[PDB]
C-alpha cells in the first residue's frame, strides 16, 4: 500500500471523521466517499462488500478497520476508455459518435447502478456538456471529461 | 496593548478601588458590587482574587484582563468563516442549518452551549443573521 | 396500414427465467428461486405458484427480441417450448403462417381469412421469401422462380394431421399458380364428392411458362367408410333404383346424414354438370352413378345360405348388366356371413376400381399431348400417426412417411453442405438421411415385414399366428428396430417398431385378409362380361405389393425435383379459430419433424453471423483487444473461446448450438458492468470535485466553534461581569 498512501488515507480520514463529529471515528456510510477522494471510484455494490452502510448512524469506524476497506476497494476493477466507448456505441444507430440528451439521461438514470436525477444535471453542468440544434451530444467528448477529472 | 481600552480600565479600577488605596481587596469588590447589583459570595470573591498572584495594583489588573481577551480572531475573520456556508452570499444562515453545524459537527456543542448561544442570537424569518451576531459577539 | 396485410404482417434475466414442463400448457414461464443439487425451485410467472423441477428438465428461452418472429431459425432457442410459444403467439393474432428454416408452417384458422384475395396475390408475385411476410403464396411463388431459373421440376409436399389444412392449402397453391385450366380446377369437385386416398398431382408447363397439361396419382383408397360410419335430378331415381332417402341405407346412415353447410341437392347437380364438361358420355356417367347406387342396393340384399327375397338383388344385376340369377348363384356357392361379407368385398372393390377408374379418366382429360418442359407437383397425403390401436393401415402410412423423411433429411443434407462449401467451413463429414435406413429395411427389404406378409398371403393355410411367429422367427434379435410390445385404452399390440417420429405397437390381427382381398373370383367373371360398358372395363383382364412399386415411383420422382414441405397443424379438436391446445399442437412437433429439423441442425452449425453484424454486437466483450472478419477473430479469441463451439467462414461466423444464447448472456452481463463503472466514475468525479469546499469549511467551523466558546466563557467571568456593570 506504500507508507505515503497510508499517510494519505490518514489525511483524508480526518477531514471526514471531523465533519460527522470529530472523535476518531467515521460513519461507515461515508467509507465510500472517503476512498472516492483518494482517486478511486468504487461501485456501491463494491463498497458495501467491504463494510459500507446504506444509512448514517448505522455504525462508525476507526482508522484501524479502515485500512483494509481501502486495501479492498483497490483490487476492484475500474473502466478504461475503450470500455466506455464500446458500451456507448451500442446506443448509436447512426454510428457517428452521437446520442441525444434525453437518451444519455436515460442511460445514466435508468440503466446499471442508477444515478439520481441530481448527480446527472450536476455532472452535465460541471463538464459543461452542450447539445446542438437537434438536441444531440458527442458522447466521445463527455466520456473524456468525466475521465479527465474535476481539475484537469 | 491598546489605549482607549486602557483609559476605561483605569477609570474603572478607580470606581472599583473604593477605599481609593490603589489596590483591589475582597472588600473593594464586595463594596462596589452591592452599591449596584447583587454581589458574589465569599467563595466567589476569594477565587476571584486568587486569579491574581499578588496584590491588585492597576498592573496585575490589566494583566489578567488582557490575558482573557487574548487568543481571538477578527470580526472580519469570523464573518468569513460564516459566509463560508453562505453560498448565495445573502448575509444570513438558515437557523436549522447553523444549529445543525454547531450541534453535531466538528467539535460538537452541547445543549447548554446551544441554549446559551441562541438565547442571544438574532434570528427572525427563519434566517440567523451572522453579521449582526458577529458584531454582538465581537466589537 | 395497408388493408392487404391485416392478417399477414406482425403488428428478463437470462439466468432466472426459463421454460419448465407443464401439463396444460406443455411448458410454463418460470423464474428460478433456489437450486439444491438437482432439485430446482422455480416460481410460475402466471399464477405465481411455486414448485420444484429436475435441473435437466429446464429449457432455455427467448428474449422479447423475437416476439411473433416470422422465421424461427433466427431465434436464439429452438426448443419445443420456444417454438410452441412463437406459433401460438402469432396464431392468436391472425398470423397462421411461419417459417422455420426451409419449412413453412400453417396452423388451421377454422375461419375465413382475407389473405388469399387477388389483391394480395398481386403483392406476392416474384417476391423473395425475406422480402414479404410469410405466406403460402411465397412458397408457391418461389418454387416457380426455381423451376424457371434453375430449369428443373419443383414439388410441394403439404403434410399434417387429418383436419389440419393439407387440402385447403393444396387448393390455394394451385389457385395461386393458376392466377399468375378450367378442367383442372373442376377435377376437385368430383374427386371430393367421391373421396380417403393419397393424392399426388403434377402440373406441366410449356416453353412460354404456361400450363400445358397435368396428371393425377392416387394412393390407398379406403374403403371402410363405404359400408360403415362411426356415429356423428328426379329423372335419375329410376335409373339407379333409389328411394331419395339416405337414412334408408345401412351402408351410409351409420354415422351422420346431413352436413351443416353442404347442400347435397346442388352438389349433385354441379357434380352431374361437371361430368358433362369433363366430356363424359351420358352412358359413362350413368355407369358411374349406377355402380355407386348399386353399393346401396348391394347392401339391401337380405339373407337366411339361401336368399331372403330377390327384389333388391335384381336391381343390382340390372344396373351392372348381368343376370340376377347367375349372380346370387356365384355368390352363395362360388365356383350366411361369408356371403354378407363378400357382398361388402364387392361393393368396396367396385367403388375402388371405380374411384381408381374415375381418377384415370380425369387424367385422360388432362394429358394434353402439348409440349412439356418442367412441372410442379403437389403432394396431399398422410403423415405419421400413432393411435390407441395401430394395424396394417398405419404401418402403410408410417412406412410411407419414413421414406419421405429420408427425403426431407436428404434435402437438408444437400442444402447444409452447400453452406459449409460456400463459406469454406471444413466438414466433409458423412451424409445424414443415413439413420432410418434400419427401419425402412426392416419393412421393405427382401425378407422384411411386408415381404413376409406378402409370401404369407399366397398360402390359404396361413393365419394370424403363423404370420406372427414367422415374423419373430426372422427379426427378433436379428434387428434391433423390431421389439416385443412394451408397456402402455391402448388396444392390443404384437410388436413395436421404432419409427423416426415414434415407437409404434402394432397389432397384426387380420393383416392377412387386409393385404389380399376376397371378392369371389366368380363374380369377377360375371362382371368381366357384363352388359354395361363401364362395368365390363372395371373388371377387364396385394395392397403392400402395389404400394411398394407405388412408393418407389413417387420417390424417384421427388428425388428428381426440389422439395418444399408444408406442415399443417390442427390447433385444436373443437374446430374453433384462435384456440390452441397445446397438448395436441405439441404432439405434432415430434412426429411433425419440425423437431427433427432442429435435431439435425444442433448436430452442426445453426446460428450463422456476418462478421459485420457480429462485430457490432459482440465487440463489448473484449474491447481491450480491438485496435470485421479479424475483429471477431480477436473477440472470440480474447474470450478464449473453444475452437469446438464455433467455426471460421469467409463472410460469416458459425457458433455451435446454444453458444450464441450464452454470448448474449455475457455479452449483456458485460455491458451492464461497464455502464456501472462509468457511473462509478461519475460518482467518484463529483465526490473529489467537492473536496476543497470541505477543508475551508472545516476551518471556518473551528473558528466559530472555538470563538463562540470564548465569548461564552468570557460572559461567565465574574471580573468581566462586574466590569461590564461599572461601565457607565
Ligand atoms: Ca467522526
From Swiss-Prot, chain A:
Function: In molluscan muscle, calcium regulation is associated with myosin rather than with actin. Muscle myosin contains two types of light chains: the catalytic light chain, essential for ATPase activity, and the regulatory light chain, a calcium-binding protein responsible for Ca(2+) dependent binding and Ca(2+) dependent Mg-ATPase activity.
Any one GO MF annotation of this record: calcium ion binding
Transmembrane parts of this sequence: none
GO CC annotation: muscle myosin complex
Organism domain of life: Eukaryota
Name listed for the protein in its UniProt record: Myosin essential light chain, striated adductor muscle
InterPro entries: CALM/Myosin/TropC-like (IPR050230), EF-hand-dom_pair (IPR011992), EF_hand_dom (IPR002048)
Organism: Argopecten irradians (Bay scallop)
Signal peptide: none
Residues annotated as domain EF-hand: 4-41, 79-114
Keywords: Motor protein, Muscle protein, Myosin, Repeat
Curated annotation (Swiss-Prot), chain B:
Function: In molluscan muscle, calcium regulation is associated with myosin rather than with actin. Muscle myosin contains two types of light chains: the catalytic light chain, essential for ATPase activity, and the regulatory light chain, a calcium-binding protein responsible for Ca(2+) dependent binding and Ca(2+) dependent Mg-ATPase activity.
Signal peptide: none
Organism: Argopecten irradians (Bay scallop)
A Pfam family it matches: EF-hand_7
InterPro entries in the cross-refs: EF-hand-dom_pair, EF_Hand_1_Ca_BS, EF_hand_dom, Myosin_RLC
GO molecular function terms attached to this record: calcium ion binding
Chain positions recorded as Ca(2+) binding sites: 17, 19, 21, 28
Residues of the EF-hand domain: 4-39, 73-108
Descriptive protein name: Myosin regulatory light chain, striated adductor muscle
Organism lineage string: Eukaryota, Metazoa, Spiralia, Lophotrochozoa, Mollusca
Gene3D superfamilies tied to this protein: EF-hand
Keyword Metal-binding in record: yes
GO cellular component, one term: myosin complex
Note: This chain binds calcium.
Entry keywords, A to Z: Calcium, Metal-binding, Motor protein, Muscle protein, Myosin, Repeat
Keyword Metal-binding: yes
Swiss-Prot record, chain C:
Chain's role: Muscle contraction. Myosin is a protein that binds to F-actin and has ATPase activity that is activated by F-actin.
The Myosin motor domain, residue ranges: 67-668
Myosin N-terminal SH3-like domain ranges (all copies): 13-63
Subunit structure: Muscle myosin is a hexameric protein that consists of 2 heavy chain subunits (MHC), 2 alkali light chain subunits (MLC) and 2 regulatory light chain subunits (MLC-2).
UniProt similarity note: Belongs to the TRAFAC class myosin-kinesin ATPase superfamily. Myosin family.
Compartment annotation: Cytoplasm, Myofibril
Limits of the IQ domain: 671-698
Portion of the parent chain present: 6 to 835 of 1938
Binding site residues for ATP: 160-167
Name recorded for this polypeptide: Myosin heavy chain, striated muscle
Chain residue ranges for the region called Actin-binding: 551-573
Amino acid at each position: 500500500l506504500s507508507q505515503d498512501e497510508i499517510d494519505d488515507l490518514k489525511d483524508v480520514f480526518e477531514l471526514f471523521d471531523f465533519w460527522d463529529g470529530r472523535d476518531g471515528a467515521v460513519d461507515a456510510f461515508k467509507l465510500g466517499d472517503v476512498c472516492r477522494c483518494l482517486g478511486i471510484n468504487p461501485r456501491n455494490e463494491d463498497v458495501f462488500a467491504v463494510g459500507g452502510t446504506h444509512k448514517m448512524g448505522e455504525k462508525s469506524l476507526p482508522f484501524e478497520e479502515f485500512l483494509p476497506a481501502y486495501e479492498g476497494l483497490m483490487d476492484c476493477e475500474q473502466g478504461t476508455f475503450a470500455d466506455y466507448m464500446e458500451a456507448f456505441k451500442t446506443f448509436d444507430r447512426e454510428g457517428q459518435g452521437f446520442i441525444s440528451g434525453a437518451e444519455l439521461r436515460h442511460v445514466l438514470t435508468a440503466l446499471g447502478e442508477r444515478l439520481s436525477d441530481e448527480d446527472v444535471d450536476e455532472i452535465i453542468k460541471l463538464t459543461d456538456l452542450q447539445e446542438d440544434l437537434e438536441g444531440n451530444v458527442k458522447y466521445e467528448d463527455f466520456v473524456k471529461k468525466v475521465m479527465a477529472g474535476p481539475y484537469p | 496593548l491598546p489605549q482607549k481600552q486602557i483609559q476605561e480600565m483605569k477609570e474603572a479600577f478607580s470606581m472599583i478601588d473604593v477605599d481609593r488605596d490603589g489596590f483591589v481587596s475582597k472588600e473593594d469588590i464586595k463594596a462596589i458590587s452591592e452599591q449596584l447589583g447583587r454581589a458574589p459570595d465569599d467563595k466567589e470573591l476569594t477565587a476571584m482574587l486568587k486569579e491574581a498572584p499578588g496584590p491588585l495594583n492597576f498592573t496585575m489588573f490589566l494583566s489578567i484582563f488582557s490575558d482573557k481577551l487574548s487568543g481571538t480572531d477578527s470580526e472580519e475573520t469570523i464573518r468569513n468563516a460564516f459566509a463560508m456556508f453562505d453560498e448565495q452570499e445573502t448575509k444570513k444562515l438558515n437557523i436549522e442549518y447553523i444549529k445543525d453545524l454547531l450541534e453535531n459537527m466538528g467539535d460538537n456543542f452541547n445543549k447548554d452551549e446551544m441554549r446559551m448561544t441562541f438565547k442571544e442570537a438574532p434570528v427572525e424569518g427563519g434566517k440567523f443573521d451572522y453579521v449582526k451576531f458577529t458584531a454582538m459577539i465581537k466589537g | 396500414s395497408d388493408p392487404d396485410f391485416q392478417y399477414l404482417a406482425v403488428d428478463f434475466d437470462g439466468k432466472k427465467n426459463c421454460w419448465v414442463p407443464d401439463e396444460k400448457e406443455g411448458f410454463a414461464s418460470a423464474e428460478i428461486q433456489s437450486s439444491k443439487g438437482d432439485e430446482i425451485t422455480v416460481k410460475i410467472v402466471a399464477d405465481s405458484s411455486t414448485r420444484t423441477v429436475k435441473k435437466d428438465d429446464i429449457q432455455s428461452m427467448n428474449p422479447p427480441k423475437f416476439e411473433k418472429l416470422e422465421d424461427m431459425a433466427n431465434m436464439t432457442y429452438l426448443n419445443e417450448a420456444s417454438v410452441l410459444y412463437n406459433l401460438r403467439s402469432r396464431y392468436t393474432s391472425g398470423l397462421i403462417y411461419t417459417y422455420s428454416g426451409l419449412f413453412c408452417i400453417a396452423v388451421n384458422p377454422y375461419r375465413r381469412l382475407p389473405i388469399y384475395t387477388d389483391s394480395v396475390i398481386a403483392k406476392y408475385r416474384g417476391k423473395r421469401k425475406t422480402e414479404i411476410p410469410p405466406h403460402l403464396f411465397s412458397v408457391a411463388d418461389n418454387a416457380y422462380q426455381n423451376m424457371v431459373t434453375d430449369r428443373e421440376n419443383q414439388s410441394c409436399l403439404i403434410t399434417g394431421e387429418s383436419g389440419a389444412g393439407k387440402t385447403e392449402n393444396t387448393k390455394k397453391v394451385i389457385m395461386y399458380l393458376a392466377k399468375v385450366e378450367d378442367q383442372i380446377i373442376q377435377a376437385n369437385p368430383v374427386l371430393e364428392a367421391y373421396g380417403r386416398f393419397g393424392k399426388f398431382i403434377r402440373i406441366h408447363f410449356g416453353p412460354t411458362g404456361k400450363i400445358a397439361g397435368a396428371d393425377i396419382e392416387t394412393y390407398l383408397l379406403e374403403k371402410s367408410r363405404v359400408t360403415y360410419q362411426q356415429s356423428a335430378i328426379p329423372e335419375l331415381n329410376d335409373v339407379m333404383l333409389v328411394t331419395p332417402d339416405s337414412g334408408l341405407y345401412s351402408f351410409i346412415n351409420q354415422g351422420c346424414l346431413t352436413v351443416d353447410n353442404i347442400d347435397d341437392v346442388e352438389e349433385f347437380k354441379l357434380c352431374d354438370e361437371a361430368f358433362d364438361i369433363l366430356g363424359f358420355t351420358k352412358e359413362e356417367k350413368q355407369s358411374m352413378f349406377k355402380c355407386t347406387a348399386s353399393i346401396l342396393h348391394m347392401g339391401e340384399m337380405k339373407f337366411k345360405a339361401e336368399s331372403d327375397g330377390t327384389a333388391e338383388a335384381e336391381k343390382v344385376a340390372f344396373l351392372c348388366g348381368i343376370n340376377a340369377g347367375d349372380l346370387l348363384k356365384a355368390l352363395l356357392k362360388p365356383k350366411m356371413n361369408q356371403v354378407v361379407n363378400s357382398v361388402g368385398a364387392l361393393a368396396k372393390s367396385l367403388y375402388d376400381r371405380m374411384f381408381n377408374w374415375l381418377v384415370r379418366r380425369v387424367n385422360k382429360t388432362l394429358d394434353t399431348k402439348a409440349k412439356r418442359n418442367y412441372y410442379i407437383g403437389v403432394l396431399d397425403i398422410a403423415g405419421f400417426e400413432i393411435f390407441d390401436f395401430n394395424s396394417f393401415e398405419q404401418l402403410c402410412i408410417n412406412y410411407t412417411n419414413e421414406r419421405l423423411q429420408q427425403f426431407f433429411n436428404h434435402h437438408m443434407f444437400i442444402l447444409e453442405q452447400e453452406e459449409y462449401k460456400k463459406e469454406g467451413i471444413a466438414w466433409e463429414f458423412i451424409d445424414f438421411g443415413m439413420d432410418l435406413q434400419m427401419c425402412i429395411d426392416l419393412i421393405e427389404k427382401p425378407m422384411g415385414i411386408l415381404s413376409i406378409l406378402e409370401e404369407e398371403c399366397m398360402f390359404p393355410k396361413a393365419d394370424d399366428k403363423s404370420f406372427q411367429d414367422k415374423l419373430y422367427q426372422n427379426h427378433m434379435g436379428k434387428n434391433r428396430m423390431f421389439t416385443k410390445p412394451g408397456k402402455p385404452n391402448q388396444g392390443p399390440a404384437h410388436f413395436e417398431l421404432h419409427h423416426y417420429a415414434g415407437n409404434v405397437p402394432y397389432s397384426i390381427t387380420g393383416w392377412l385378409e387386409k393385404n389380399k382381398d376376397p371378392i369371389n373370383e366368380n363374380v369377377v367373371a360375371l362382371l368381366g362380361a357384363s352388359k354395361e360398358p363401364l362395368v365390363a372395363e372395371l373388371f377387364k383382364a396385394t395392397i403392400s405389393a402395389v404400394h411398394r412399386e407405388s412408393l418407389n415411383k413417387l420417390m424417384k420422382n421427388l428425388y428428381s425435383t426440389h422439395p418444399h414441405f408444408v406442415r399443417c397443424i390442427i390447433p385444436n379438436e373443437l374446430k374453433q379459430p384462435g384456440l390452441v391446445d397445446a397438448e395436441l399442437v405439441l404432439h405434432q412437433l415430434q412426429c411433425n419433424g419440425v423437431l427433427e429439423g432442429i435435431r439435425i441442425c444442433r448436430k452442426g452449425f445453426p446460428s450463422r453471423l456476418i462478421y459485420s453484424e457480429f462485430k457490432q454486437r459482440y465487440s463489448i466483450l473484449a474491447p481491450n483487444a480491438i485496435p470485421g472478419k479479424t475483429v471477431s477473430e480477436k473477440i472470440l479469441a480474447g474470450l478464449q473461446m473453444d475452437p469446438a463451439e464455433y467455426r471460421l467462414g469467409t463472410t460469416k461466423v458459425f457458433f455451435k448450438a446454444g453458444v450464441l444464447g450464452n454470448l448474449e448472456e455475457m455479452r449483456d452481463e458485460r455491458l451492464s458492468k461497464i455502464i456501472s463503472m462509468f457511473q462509478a466514475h461519475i460518482r467518484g468525479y463529483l465526490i473529489r470535485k467537492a473536496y476543497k469546499k470541505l477543508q475551508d469549511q472545516r476551518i471556518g467551523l473551528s473558528v466559530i466553534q472555538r470563538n463562540i466558546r470564548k465569548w461564552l466563557v468570557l460572559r461567565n467571568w465574574q471580573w468581566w461581569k462586574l466590569y461590564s456593570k461599572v461601565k457607565p
